[PDB]
Write a protein that holds these residues in place. Structure first.
Motif, PDB file in Angstrom:
ATOM      1  N   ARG A  38      -4.480 -21.680 -14.027  1.00  0.00           N
ATOM      2  CA  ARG A  38      -4.088 -20.618 -14.945  1.00  0.00           C
ATOM      3  C   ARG A  38      -4.369 -19.246 -14.341  1.00  0.00           C
ATOM      4  NH1 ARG A  38      -0.838 -20.801 -19.646  1.00  0.00           N
ATOM      5  NH2 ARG A  38      -0.361 -23.046 -19.686  1.00  0.00           N
ATOM      6  N   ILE A  39      -5.557 -19.090 -13.767  1.00  0.00           N
ATOM      7  CA  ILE A  39      -5.949 -17.828 -13.153  1.00  0.00           C
ATOM      8  C   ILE A  39      -5.100 -17.528 -11.922  1.00  0.00           C
ATOM      9  CG2 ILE A  39      -7.789 -16.555 -12.005  1.00  0.00           C
ATOM     10  CD1 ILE A  39      -9.644 -18.678 -13.691  1.00  0.00           C
ATOM     11  N   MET A  40      -5.178 -18.407 -10.929  1.00  0.00           N
ATOM     12  CA  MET A  40      -4.413 -18.238  -9.699  1.00  0.00           C
ATOM     13  C   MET A  40      -2.954 -17.917 -10.005  1.00  0.00           C
ATOM     14  SD  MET A  40      -6.642 -18.949  -7.172  1.00  0.00           S
ATOM     15  CE  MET A  40      -6.984 -20.233  -5.973  1.00  0.00           C
ATOM     16  N   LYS A  41      -2.333 -18.746 -10.837  1.00  0.00           N
ATOM     17  CA  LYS A  41      -0.937 -18.553 -11.212  1.00  0.00           C
ATOM     18  C   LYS A  41      -0.683 -17.108 -11.632  1.00  0.00           C
ATOM     19  CE  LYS A  41       0.959 -19.705 -15.246  1.00  0.00           C
ATOM     20  NZ  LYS A  41       1.584 -20.465 -16.364  1.00  0.00           N
ATOM     21  N   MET A  42      -1.365 -16.675 -12.688  1.00  0.00           N
ATOM     22  CA  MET A  42      -1.214 -15.314 -13.188  1.00  0.00           C
ATOM     23  C   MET A  42      -1.403 -14.298 -12.066  1.00  0.00           C
ATOM     24  SD  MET A  42      -0.685 -15.067 -16.617  1.00  0.00           S
ATOM     25  CE  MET A  42      -1.589 -13.656 -17.250  1.00  0.00           C
ATOM     26  N   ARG A  43      -2.325 -14.595 -11.155  1.00  0.00           N
ATOM     27  CA  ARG A  43      -2.603 -13.706 -10.033  1.00  0.00           C
ATOM     28  C   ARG A  43      -1.929 -14.210  -8.760  1.00  0.00           C
ATOM     29  NH1 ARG A  43      -4.303  -9.965 -13.576  1.00  0.00           N
ATOM     30  NH2 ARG A  43      -5.617 -11.011 -15.139  1.00  0.00           N
ATOM     31  N   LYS A  44      -0.727 -13.709  -8.496  1.00  0.00           N
ATOM     32  CA  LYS A  44       0.024 -14.106  -7.311  1.00  0.00           C
ATOM     33  C   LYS A  44      -0.913 -14.376  -6.138  1.00  0.00           C
ATOM     34  CE  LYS A  44       4.339 -12.974  -6.951  1.00  0.00           C
ATOM     35  NZ  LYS A  44       4.010 -13.113  -5.506  1.00  0.00           N
ATOM     36  N   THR A  45      -1.873 -13.479  -5.934  1.00  0.00           N
ATOM     37  CA  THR A  45      -2.833 -13.620  -4.847  1.00  0.00           C
ATOM     38  C   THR A  45      -4.229 -13.191  -5.287  1.00  0.00           C
ATOM     39  OG1 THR A  45      -1.072 -13.108  -3.245  1.00  0.00           O
ATOM     40  CG2 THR A  45      -3.350 -13.055  -2.446  1.00  0.00           C
ATOM     41  N   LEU A  46      -5.167 -14.131  -5.262  1.00  0.00           N
ATOM     42  CA  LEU A  46      -6.542 -13.850  -5.659  1.00  0.00           C
ATOM     43  C   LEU A  46      -7.526 -14.355  -4.607  1.00  0.00           C
ATOM     44  CD1 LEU A  46      -7.337 -12.444  -8.363  1.00  0.00           C
ATOM     45  CD2 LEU A  46      -8.283 -14.652  -9.059  1.00  0.00           C
ATOM     46  N   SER A  47      -8.690 -13.718  -4.539  1.00  0.00           N
ATOM     47  CA  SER A  47      -9.716 -14.102  -3.576  1.00  0.00           C
ATOM     48  C   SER A  47     -10.732 -15.045  -4.212  1.00  0.00           C
ATOM     49  CB  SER A  47     -10.426 -12.861  -3.033  1.00  0.00           C
ATOM     50  OG  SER A  47      -9.646 -12.221  -2.037  1.00  0.00           O
ATOM     51  N   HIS A  48     -11.688 -15.503  -3.410  1.00  0.00           N
ATOM     52  CA  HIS A  48     -12.721 -16.412  -3.894  1.00  0.00           C
ATOM     53  C   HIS A  48     -13.553 -15.754  -4.991  1.00  0.00           C
ATOM     54  CE1 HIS A  48     -15.381 -19.978  -3.308  1.00  0.00           C
ATOM     55  NE2 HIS A  48     -16.273 -19.152  -3.826  1.00  0.00           N
ATOM     56  N   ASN A  49     -14.115 -14.589  -4.683  1.00  0.00           N
ATOM     57  CA  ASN A  49     -14.935 -13.859  -5.643  1.00  0.00           C
ATOM     58  C   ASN A  49     -14.194 -13.675  -6.963  1.00  0.00           C
ATOM     59  OD1 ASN A  49     -13.098 -12.240  -4.252  1.00  0.00           O
ATOM     60  ND2 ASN A  49     -14.720 -11.116  -3.180  1.00  0.00           N
ATOM     61  N   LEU A  50     -12.989 -13.119  -6.886  1.00  0.00           N
ATOM     62  CA  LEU A  50     -12.176 -12.888  -8.075  1.00  0.00           C
ATOM     63  C   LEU A  50     -11.905 -14.196  -8.812  1.00  0.00           C
ATOM     64  CD1 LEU A  50     -11.287 -10.144  -9.025  1.00  0.00           C
ATOM     65  CD2 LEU A  50     -11.759 -10.171  -6.569  1.00  0.00           C
ATOM     66  N   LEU A  51     -11.774 -15.279  -8.054  1.00  0.00           N
ATOM     67  CA  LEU A  51     -11.514 -16.593  -8.635  1.00  0.00           C
ATOM     68  C   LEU A  51     -12.743 -17.114  -9.372  1.00  0.00           C
ATOM     69  CD1 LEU A  51      -9.917 -19.425  -8.762  1.00  0.00           C
ATOM     70  CD2 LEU A  51     -11.219 -19.934  -6.688  1.00  0.00           C
ATOM     71  N   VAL A  52     -13.780 -17.456  -8.614  1.00  0.00           N
ATOM     72  CA  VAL A  52     -15.017 -17.966  -9.195  1.00  0.00           C
ATOM     73  C   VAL A  52     -15.434 -17.143 -10.408  1.00  0.00           C
ATOM     74  CG1 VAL A  52     -15.798 -18.808  -6.956  1.00  0.00           C
ATOM     75  CG2 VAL A  52     -16.501 -16.539  -7.750  1.00  0.00           C
ATOM     76  N   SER A  53     -15.216 -15.834 -10.331  1.00  0.00           N
ATOM     77  CA  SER A  53     -15.573 -14.935 -11.423  1.00  0.00           C
ATOM     78  C   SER A  53     -14.734 -15.226 -12.663  1.00  0.00           C
ATOM     79  CB  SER A  53     -15.382 -13.478 -10.995  1.00  0.00           C
ATOM     80  OG  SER A  53     -15.759 -12.588 -12.031  1.00  0.00           O
ATOM     81  N   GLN A  90      -8.607 -15.424   0.762  1.00  0.00           N
ATOM     82  CA  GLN A  90      -7.507 -15.032  -0.112  1.00  0.00           C
ATOM     83  C   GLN A  90      -6.524 -16.182  -0.300  1.00  0.00           C
ATOM     84  OE1 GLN A  90      -5.757 -11.217  -0.549  1.00  0.00           O
ATOM     85  NE2 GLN A  90      -3.834 -11.837   0.431  1.00  0.00           N
ATOM     86  N   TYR A  91      -6.150 -16.435  -1.549  1.00  0.00           N
ATOM     87  CA  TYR A  91      -5.217 -17.511  -1.865  1.00  0.00           C
ATOM     88  C   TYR A  91      -3.976 -16.967  -2.567  1.00  0.00           C
ATOM     89  CZ  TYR A  91      -9.814 -19.672  -1.388  1.00  0.00           C
ATOM     90  OH  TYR A  91     -11.070 -20.028  -0.952  1.00  0.00           O
ATOM     91  N   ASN A  92      -2.808 -17.416  -2.120  1.00  0.00           N
ATOM     92  CA  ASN A  92      -1.546 -16.975  -2.704  1.00  0.00           C
ATOM     93  C   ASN A  92      -0.951 -18.061  -3.596  1.00  0.00           C
ATOM     94  OD1 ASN A  92      -0.942 -14.416  -0.713  1.00  0.00           O
ATOM     95  ND2 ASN A  92      -1.859 -16.149   0.384  1.00  0.00           N
ATOM     96  N   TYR A  93      -0.088 -17.653  -4.520  1.00  0.00           N
ATOM     97  CA  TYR A  93       0.550 -18.589  -5.437  1.00  0.00           C
ATOM     98  C   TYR A  93       1.814 -19.181  -4.820  1.00  0.00           C
ATOM     99  CZ  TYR A  93       2.512 -20.536  -9.726  1.00  0.00           C
ATOM    100  OH  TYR A  93       3.032 -21.383 -10.678  1.00  0.00           O
ATOM    101  N   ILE A  94       1.976 -20.491  -4.962  1.00  0.00           N
ATOM    102  CA  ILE A  94       3.142 -21.179  -4.421  1.00  0.00           C
ATOM    103  C   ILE A  94       3.797 -22.064  -5.476  1.00  0.00           C
ATOM    104  CG2 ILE A  94       2.591 -21.172  -1.969  1.00  0.00           C
ATOM    105  CD1 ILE A  94       1.003 -23.636  -2.296  1.00  0.00           C
TER     106      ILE A  94
END
Length: 101
Positions: A38-53, A90-94
């Protein structure tokens, strides 16, 4: 799917005992993997910190480092997220799928 040939669909129970159930095993893994997608999707590209948070904010319960990390890596290999050539932080949405809002 769905219960099947059922009339009403709604369940909810509360238990307060140190002991550990078995259903809490599936509910957890889902809570995470779900919060991530849900998070990653909404965020085309998110990092680890932003994710775990973000994930933590979505989960009112503490998650282990082994499970959390595992969930991420997997998803990434599950054709859901890709590591930026620059850094794996950094992780991108696919994932492919329609959306409304």
């Amino acid at each position: 799917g769905s219960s099947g040939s059922s009339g009403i669909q709604m369940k909810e129970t509360v238990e307060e005992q140190a002991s550990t159930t078995e259903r809490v095993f599936q509910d957890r893994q889902y809570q995470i993997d779900a919060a991530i997608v849900r998070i990653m999707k909404m965020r085309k590209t998110l990092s680890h910190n932003l994710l775990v948070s973000e994930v933590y904010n979505q989960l009112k319960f503490p998650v282990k480092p082994a499970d959390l990390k595992k969930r991420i890596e997997s998803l990434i290999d599950r054709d859901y997220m890709e590591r930026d050539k620059e850094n794996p932080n950094q992780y991108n949405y696919i994932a492919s799928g329609p959306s409304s809002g």
